[PDB]
Amino acid sequence: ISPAQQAQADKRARDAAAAKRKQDTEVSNAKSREDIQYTMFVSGLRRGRLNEFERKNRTDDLAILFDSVTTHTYTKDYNKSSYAVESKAKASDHVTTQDGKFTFSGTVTDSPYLIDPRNMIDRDTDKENPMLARRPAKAIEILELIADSHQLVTLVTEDNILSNYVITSFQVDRSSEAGSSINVQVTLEEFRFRTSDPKKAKNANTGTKQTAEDGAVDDSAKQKRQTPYIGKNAETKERWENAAIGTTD
């Protein structure tokens, strides 16, 4: 080791730590904005569903389009119970419904044909120089932000419309077979379920509450200093609080 090597060690801590701060703060920004909704147009865009793509303003309602969607599937499941009888046979009892699962596969190409600015992927893509715009890269940092922030996605498929679906996994493969493009697969499942008018609000609960941690009395517990007053209206306050409130001693 050497004193110079200490500087090199410090770089590791800073740059590595700084990297997670950018990722962590950005994720924290999500889950804080509730006036934002994400929608994915798997199919149907050119058949009827064009009506819904016109309603999105690139600011709070965002659309995800894919250069190509190879296949998509939808499968719901149910569970059936069964109990045995003395007749050496089995009968049945109530049944249950197990939410639902959706998956699809798609591809994002570095040489697009239909560059529609309304699509949220093409927010900044250059019209006349596509391959240097890094479309394949630009899709990963936006798809990952949606998934890791636990957004409730809405899927607009040609057959039907699905809501309250949460992404569970996805893949990105730059195989040598195609190149200049990324093969993308995704899976979702149904996540089936202050302000506001006092009229609509009902009785809430908060449970046991300790002393507020933003003001005095915690400092006496944390062994800190009380904040001095700013003087204004002196000789009027001090006489009253000192007599009616006292000091923590």
């Binding site: 049945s92 249950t96 009785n203 046991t208």
Partner: protein
Amino acid sequence: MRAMERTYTLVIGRPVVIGEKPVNIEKFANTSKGDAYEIKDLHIEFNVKKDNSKEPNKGYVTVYNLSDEVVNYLSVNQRESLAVMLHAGYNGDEKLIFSGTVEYVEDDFPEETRTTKFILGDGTLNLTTATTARSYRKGTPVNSVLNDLIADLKLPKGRVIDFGNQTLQTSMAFTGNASQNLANLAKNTGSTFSVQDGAVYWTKEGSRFNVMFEISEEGGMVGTPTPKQPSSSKKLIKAHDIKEDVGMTVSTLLNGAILPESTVYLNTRYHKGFYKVAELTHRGGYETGDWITELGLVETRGELI
């Protein structure tokens, strides 16, 4: 056309406070806000055992993904005994299956799913704190002693069989918990004492009460009956003779309208006859699991009280 699907309801009320009159868990259901916290469509797993003995009947429950407000209401009252009722049935009706106080409650929320736990006791508070101090002289009628002690216990009288013209042979004194003293009088007089769903039941061993329940393939039986000994040990015998000593086992779809001290008729193809009930266990898994009840029957050899 529908299927035959399960249904249930769980209610939580005010803290139970014992006073100077019999306790009824029914009247504590309503909360200060009025309507109670009802939980219907959430996966629930529960196990409720019942018996005819000194100990109270206890049942266990588990609920997944409860709302934060309800959990907050139970974080408070952790020093108090909230009243709880449970109902179950099949999509058209729900029979009372347990009622008592929340003895224990804990929450574990590792990552994906929170899991609340409960332990409920059927009259645990009364049976374990009701003190007494009574005495009687030679010649006192035993029928008077029994009534005096039960009134001390502060519970409704489900059913009692008086002793007749029996009289004490020696002076008696009773102290400590009333339940313990009564359970001792059971041994020396061939009587069974046991509280259940708030009701006091005092009956006589060996004898039994009509066919209040009939078991058959139509009655949702599950498998054939099998003979199982009613105790985990054998007693020496002269070979009171009237006492128990034999039994059988049966299983059936969940049916809360049954109690340990009742009587059942067994209409199967091998076994036929009348039996007492001695033990119950109710199990349930809403989304996944059984929805059945298990009965431990005991043969009877006494008079038809």
